[PDB]
Short mmCIF file of C-alpha atoms in Angstrom, two decimals:
data_model
loop_
_atom_site.label_atom_id
_atom_site.label_comp_id
_atom_site.label_asym_id
_atom_site.label_seq_id
_atom_site.Cartn_x
_atom_site.Cartn_y
_atom_site.Cartn_z
CA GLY A 27 -24.03 -7.38 1.89
CA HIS A 28 -20.30 -7.20 1.42
CA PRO A 29 -19.34 -10.85 4.10
CA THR A 30 -17.94 -13.56 1.57
CA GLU A 31 -15.71 -15.83 3.57
CA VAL A 32 -12.10 -14.60 2.14
CA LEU A 33 -10.00 -11.46 3.52
CA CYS A 34 -8.45 -9.25 1.03
CA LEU A 35 -5.02 -7.59 1.52
CA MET A 36 -3.95 -4.24 -0.65
CA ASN A 37 -1.88 -1.86 -0.64
CA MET A 38 1.09 -3.43 1.49
CA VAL A 39 2.66 -5.71 -0.97
CA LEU A 40 5.14 -4.64 -3.78
CA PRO A 41 6.23 -6.32 -6.86
CA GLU A 42 9.91 -4.92 -6.24
CA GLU A 43 9.31 -7.17 -2.88
CA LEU A 44 7.51 -10.22 -3.97
CA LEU A 45 10.48 -11.29 -6.02
CA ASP A 46 12.57 -12.45 -3.36
CA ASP A 47 12.80 -15.82 -1.88
CA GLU A 48 13.53 -13.86 2.06
CA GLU A 49 10.59 -11.20 1.30
CA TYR A 50 8.26 -13.55 0.00
CA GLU A 51 8.95 -15.93 3.00
CA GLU A 52 8.57 -12.75 5.34
CA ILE A 53 4.91 -12.15 3.76
CA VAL A 54 3.57 -15.02 4.02
CA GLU A 55 5.07 -16.57 7.26
CA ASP A 56 3.74 -13.17 8.98
CA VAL A 57 0.59 -12.58 7.25
CA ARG A 58 -0.54 -16.15 8.23
CA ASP A 59 0.69 -16.37 12.04
CA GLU A 60 -1.25 -12.88 12.06
CA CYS A 61 -4.39 -14.19 9.76
CA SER A 62 -4.54 -16.89 12.65
CA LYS A 63 -5.00 -14.66 15.88
CA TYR A 64 -9.01 -13.92 14.15
CA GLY A 65 -9.94 -17.64 13.53
CA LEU A 66 -8.77 -19.82 10.80
CA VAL A 67 -7.32 -19.23 7.84
CA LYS A 68 -7.47 -21.81 5.44
CA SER A 69 -4.80 -20.83 3.06
CA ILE A 70 -2.70 -17.88 1.26
CA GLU A 71 -2.59 -16.45 -2.57
CA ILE A 72 0.32 -14.26 -2.70
CA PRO A 73 1.20 -13.54 -6.35
CA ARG A 74 4.88 -14.13 -7.35
CA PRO A 75 5.61 -12.53 -10.94
CA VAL A 76 8.56 -14.89 -11.92
CA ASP A 77 11.63 -12.16 -13.05
CA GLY A 78 8.87 -10.18 -14.11
CA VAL A 79 6.71 -13.33 -15.29
CA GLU A 80 3.44 -11.90 -13.46
CA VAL A 81 4.19 -8.24 -13.14
CA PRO A 82 1.21 -6.88 -14.79
CA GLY A 83 -1.35 -7.31 -12.15
CA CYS A 84 0.69 -7.66 -9.06
CA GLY A 85 0.74 -5.81 -5.97
CA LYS A 86 -2.76 -7.14 -4.27
CA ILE A 87 -2.82 -10.27 -2.24
CA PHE A 88 -5.11 -12.13 0.42
CA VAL A 89 -5.68 -15.12 2.67
CA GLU A 90 -8.59 -17.99 2.09
CA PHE A 91 -10.57 -17.79 5.30
CA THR A 92 -12.73 -20.77 6.26
CA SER A 93 -15.92 -18.38 8.38
CA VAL A 94 -16.92 -14.92 7.63
CA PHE A 95 -17.31 -14.22 11.00
CA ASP A 96 -13.33 -14.27 11.97
CA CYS A 97 -13.23 -13.07 8.27
CA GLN A 98 -14.92 -10.15 9.93
CA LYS A 99 -13.40 -9.44 13.20
CA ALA A 100 -9.85 -9.70 11.44
CA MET A 101 -10.20 -7.48 8.69
CA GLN A 102 -11.81 -4.90 11.26
CA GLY A 103 -8.43 -4.70 13.00
CA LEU A 104 -6.65 -4.58 10.21
CA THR A 105 -7.98 -1.47 8.71
CA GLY A 106 -5.81 1.35 9.12
CA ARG A 107 -2.94 0.16 10.45
CA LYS A 108 0.22 -0.23 8.79
CA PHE A 109 2.12 -3.25 6.53
CA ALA A 110 5.59 -0.62 7.30
CA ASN A 111 4.58 2.68 6.09
CA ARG A 112 1.76 2.72 4.29
CA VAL A 113 -1.97 2.20 5.45
CA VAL A 114 -3.16 -1.20 4.24
CA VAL A 115 -6.85 -1.25 2.41
CA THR A 116 -8.61 -4.66 3.55
CA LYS A 117 -11.69 -5.37 2.14
CA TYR A 118 -13.72 -9.22 1.29
CA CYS A 119 -13.08 -11.38 -1.30
CA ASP A 120 -15.13 -14.03 -3.02
CA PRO A 121 -13.81 -17.81 -2.78
CA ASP A 122 -14.56 -18.26 -5.91
CA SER A 123 -12.79 -15.74 -7.25
CA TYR A 124 -10.16 -16.97 -5.52
CA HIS A 125 -9.50 -20.41 -6.70
CA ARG A 126 -9.06 -19.09 -10.03
CA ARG A 127 -7.57 -16.24 -9.10
CA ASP A 128 -9.50 -14.15 -11.04
CA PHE A 129 -8.49 -11.25 -8.00
CA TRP A 130 -12.15 -10.27 -7.84
CA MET B 15 3.41 -48.36 18.61
CA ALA B 16 2.90 -51.13 15.84
CA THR B 17 5.97 -50.89 13.78
CA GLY B 18 7.45 -47.56 12.59
CA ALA B 19 6.55 -43.71 13.46
CA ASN B 20 6.57 -40.80 11.12
CA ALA B 21 6.40 -38.30 14.15
CA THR B 22 6.61 -34.06 13.19
CA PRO B 23 9.70 -31.66 12.40
CA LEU B 24 10.14 -29.67 15.74
CA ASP B 25 9.39 -26.21 14.46
CA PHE B 26 7.36 -23.96 16.65
CA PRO B 27 5.53 -21.02 15.31
CA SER B 28 8.03 -17.70 14.98
CA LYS B 29 7.14 -14.51 14.02
CA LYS B 30 4.70 -13.56 16.76
CA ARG B 31 6.27 -10.86 18.61
CA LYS B 32 9.83 -9.09 17.34
CA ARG B 33 8.64 -6.72 14.43
CA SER B 34 5.27 -5.05 14.01
CA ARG B 35 3.57 -5.63 10.36
CA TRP B 36 0.71 -3.50 11.52
CA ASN B 37 1.92 0.09 13.17
CA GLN B 38 0.47 3.44 12.57
CA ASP B 39 2.68 6.16 13.72
CA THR B 40 6.08 6.29 12.81
CA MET B 41 9.29 8.97 13.05
CA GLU B 42 7.70 10.55 16.59
CA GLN B 43 5.49 9.21 19.16
CA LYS B 44 2.06 7.81 18.78
CA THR B 45 -0.45 10.33 19.24
CA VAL B 46 -1.41 11.61 15.80
CA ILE B 47 -4.13 9.17 14.97
CA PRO B 48 -5.58 8.40 11.07
CA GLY B 49 -9.57 8.19 11.50
CA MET B 50 -10.72 6.83 7.86
CA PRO B 51 -11.73 2.73 7.24
CA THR B 52 -10.08 1.36 4.14
CA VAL B 53 -12.33 -1.41 3.52
CA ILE B 54 -14.52 -0.77 0.35
CA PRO B 55 -17.88 -0.74 0.12
CA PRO B 56 -20.24 -3.01 -2.19
CA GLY B 57 -21.61 -0.68 -4.97
CA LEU B 58 -18.60 0.57 -6.55
CA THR B 59 -16.65 0.38 -9.68
CA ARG B 60 -12.69 -0.37 -10.05
CA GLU B 61 -12.11 3.15 -11.45
CA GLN B 62 -13.82 4.56 -7.88
CA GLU B 63 -12.34 1.89 -5.92
CA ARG B 64 -8.79 3.13 -6.86
CA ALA B 65 -9.93 6.84 -6.27
CA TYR B 66 -11.30 6.30 -2.46
CA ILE B 67 -8.35 4.26 -1.98
CA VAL B 68 -6.10 7.09 -3.60
CA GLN B 69 -7.45 9.90 -1.80
CA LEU B 70 -6.41 8.14 1.81
CA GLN B 71 -3.11 7.49 0.56
CA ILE B 72 -2.89 11.34 -0.73
CA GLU B 73 -4.46 12.44 2.53
CA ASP B 74 -1.47 9.84 4.48
CA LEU B 75 1.13 11.25 1.89
CA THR B 76 0.30 14.79 2.58
CA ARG B 77 0.34 14.35 6.37
CA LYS B 78 3.35 12.85 5.77
CA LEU B 79 5.10 16.21 3.50
CA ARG B 80 3.03 18.40 6.58
CA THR B 81 5.06 16.77 9.76
CA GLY B 82 7.52 14.85 7.85
CA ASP B 83 6.28 11.59 8.54
CA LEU B 84 8.47 9.21 6.65
CA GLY B 85 9.61 6.53 9.49
CA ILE B 86 11.78 3.99 7.11
CA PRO B 87 14.07 5.12 4.62
CA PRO B 88 12.55 3.65 0.68
CA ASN B 89 16.06 2.13 0.40
CA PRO B 90 17.80 0.88 3.57
CA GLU B 91 20.19 -0.58 1.78
CA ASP B 92 21.10 1.54 -1.80
CA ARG B 93 21.43 -0.20 -5.36
CA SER B 94 24.25 0.10 -7.90
CA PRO B 95 24.65 3.86 -7.42
CA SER B 96 22.82 5.83 -10.68
CA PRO B 97 22.14 9.25 -11.82
CA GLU B 98 18.74 11.11 -12.05
CA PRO B 99 16.53 10.32 -15.50
CA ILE B 100 15.70 13.97 -15.28
CA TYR B 101 17.82 17.19 -16.74
CA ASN B 102 18.72 19.44 -14.11
CA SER B 103 20.63 22.47 -14.84
CA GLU B 104 21.81 23.17 -11.47
CA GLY B 105 20.50 23.41 -7.65
CA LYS B 106 20.44 25.32 -4.42
CA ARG B 107 23.29 24.94 -2.41
CA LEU B 108 21.49 25.59 1.45
CA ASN B 109 18.30 24.02 -0.07
CA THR B 110 18.66 19.67 -2.03
CA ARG B 111 17.95 17.13 0.42
CA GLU B 112 15.31 18.15 2.23
CA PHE B 113 13.28 19.55 -1.05
CA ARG B 114 14.60 16.22 -2.56
CA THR B 115 12.25 14.32 0.11
CA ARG B 116 9.54 16.90 0.04
CA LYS B 117 9.26 17.03 -3.62
CA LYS B 118 9.45 13.20 -3.65
CA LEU B 119 6.51 13.26 -1.55
CA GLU B 120 4.86 15.81 -3.79
CA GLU B 121 5.29 13.28 -6.80
CA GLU B 122 3.79 10.38 -4.98
CA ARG B 123 0.56 12.26 -4.05
CA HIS B 124 0.97 13.49 -7.46
CA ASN B 125 1.01 10.38 -9.01
CA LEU B 126 -2.58 9.84 -7.23
CA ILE B 127 -3.61 12.42 -7.74
CA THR B 128 -3.15 12.25 -11.63
CA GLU B 129 -4.75 8.73 -11.21
CA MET B 130 -7.65 10.00 -8.99
CA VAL B 131 -8.08 13.44 -11.56
CA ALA B 132 -7.90 10.68 -14.57
CA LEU B 133 -10.52 8.14 -11.97
CA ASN B 134 -12.81 10.87 -10.98
CA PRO B 135 -13.06 14.56 -13.21
CA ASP B 136 -15.29 15.80 -9.74
CA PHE B 137 -12.19 15.02 -7.62
CA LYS B 138 -10.52 17.98 -5.36
CA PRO B 139 -7.16 17.80 -5.13
CA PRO B 140 -5.63 19.25 -1.62
CA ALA B 141 -4.77 22.69 -1.08
CA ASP B 142 -1.51 22.79 -1.25
CA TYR B 143 -0.65 20.75 -4.69
CA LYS B 144 -0.61 23.16 -7.31
CA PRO B 145 -1.01 22.62 -11.25
CA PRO B 146 2.25 22.65 -13.15
CA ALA B 147 3.41 25.62 -15.84
CA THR B 148 3.75 28.98 -14.30
CA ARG B 149 2.65 30.61 -17.43
CA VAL B 150 3.37 33.82 -18.98
CA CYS B 151 2.24 37.65 -19.13
CA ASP B 152 -0.77 39.01 -16.85
CA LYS B 153 -4.15 37.60 -17.51
CA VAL B 154 -5.41 36.11 -20.66
CA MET B 155 -5.62 37.71 -24.01
CA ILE B 156 -8.83 38.31 -26.51
CA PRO B 157 -9.20 36.57 -29.26
CA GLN B 158 -10.61 38.94 -32.32
CA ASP B 159 -13.12 38.46 -35.15
#
């Protein structure tokens, strides 16, 4: 009673990082190629506060998956890892909220 | 071919094998294994979610101060030199770097402690964490009516 459709990626992105063009392209690209190892990933939604435009809420990103099958086998292997020096808290997200970027 | 061709830009998928973005052990050899799921269960609150997340970060932070597991520096390329916001009268000559790192770690943990205690009043902080204010005198006095 948890699988929805899209994967969630928390505790692995700071607002001081999602503000640079180098850091951004580094996360979106890597996170993409990685997420595309357990199945198929439609897209990826990662906030990018414009000079601090979307800071009040920044810190949580994710990817739009195609099926919960691979989404499950993915998060089950992403939990307990480390983006750099902090344990990544992975979870599940509703495709609906994703579309509206409601972040729920 | 009929008329003209569009084709595709030549670019093979990179960022596959160069920099690990899903490690677990740093500063030392891989042997210390953290065993705790991060996924959050269906049927909680936004406050409790943080408490569950932060508890894991608190223990992992404490792990860091306990063994010295830092791994990568907070600022690899330092910005423009800037002093401290806190007023300090004087420091030790033997102790300063060590403490700066370890205390900073405690502050990371404490940041989460304060948050988790606010989110959950029943939360039990780690034993090494001490409540601020050393206080004066011995025990409590007696108010008379």
